[PDB]
């Protein structure tokens, strides 16, 4: 579950210690540290490439990092798009069952994801966005009831509400920060957790 390094990579890493190279260690290395658990192959392979390229051209990583930050706006949009896309496919994650209450939960779940997916488009007018915070609060309060009208299930209730809280937290920071990207990513996690609830009443 842990990367291995070749003799040559070991040798590179030792040869490459000038200050200009520190972003290799400060930024990429923790990246590879987290990647490691998810994708051992990828982590190792990419670490190898960075190490070599950096040895051979001290400065290279920093150039790459600074270029990526220069494309913040592209990522901002993509992330908007992801959030927008998230509210779709009502059919799949929903409860298959056509009932009076089980179909009613789907309806209350589809509602919330929808408000949430629209954030990138309301976040600019403080008035509309303010309204949307409210509408979201409803959708949440209204939804969590529809759950208690109908123990790993407990864990989802906990997680949902935890991610529910986190979204508020991130919200509070945006009015102190102007960094919408934190809001989107956040909203988008809540949508996912909403999907996870309905997964347990599918199993």
């Amino acid at each position: 579950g842990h990367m291995r390094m070749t003799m040559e990579e070991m040798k590179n890493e030792a040869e490459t210690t000038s200050m200009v190279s520190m972003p290799l260690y400060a930024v990429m290395y923790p990246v590879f540290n987290e990647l490691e658990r998810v994708n051992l192959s990828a982590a190792q392979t990419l670490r190898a490439a960075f190490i070599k390229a950096e040895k051979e051209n001290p400065g290279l990583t920093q150039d790459i990092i600074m270029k990526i930050l220069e494309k913040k706006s592209v990522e901002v949009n993509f992330t908007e798009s992801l959030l927008r896309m998230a509210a779709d496919d009502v059919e799949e994650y929903m409860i298959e069952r056509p009932e009076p209450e089980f179909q009613d939960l789907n309806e209350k779940a589809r509602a919330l994801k929808q408000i949430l997916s629209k954030i990138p488009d309301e976040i600019n007018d403080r008035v509309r966005f303010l309204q949307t915070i409210k509408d979201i609060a409803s959708a949440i309060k209204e939804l969590l009831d529809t759950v208690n009208n109908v123990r790993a299930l407990e864990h989802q209730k906990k997680e949902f509400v935890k991610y529910s809280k986190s979204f508020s937290d991130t919200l509070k920071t945006y009015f102190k920060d102007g960094k919408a990207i934190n809001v989107f990513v956040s909203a988008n996690r809540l949508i996912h957790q909403t999907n996870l609830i309905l997964q347990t009443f599918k199993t």
Binding site: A137, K141, S164, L171
Partner: peptide
């Protein structure tokens, strides 16, 4: 519910 009403007021 405490958190919920709090967020709502936020």
């Amino acid at each position: 519910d405490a958190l919920l009403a709090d967020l709502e007021s936020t």
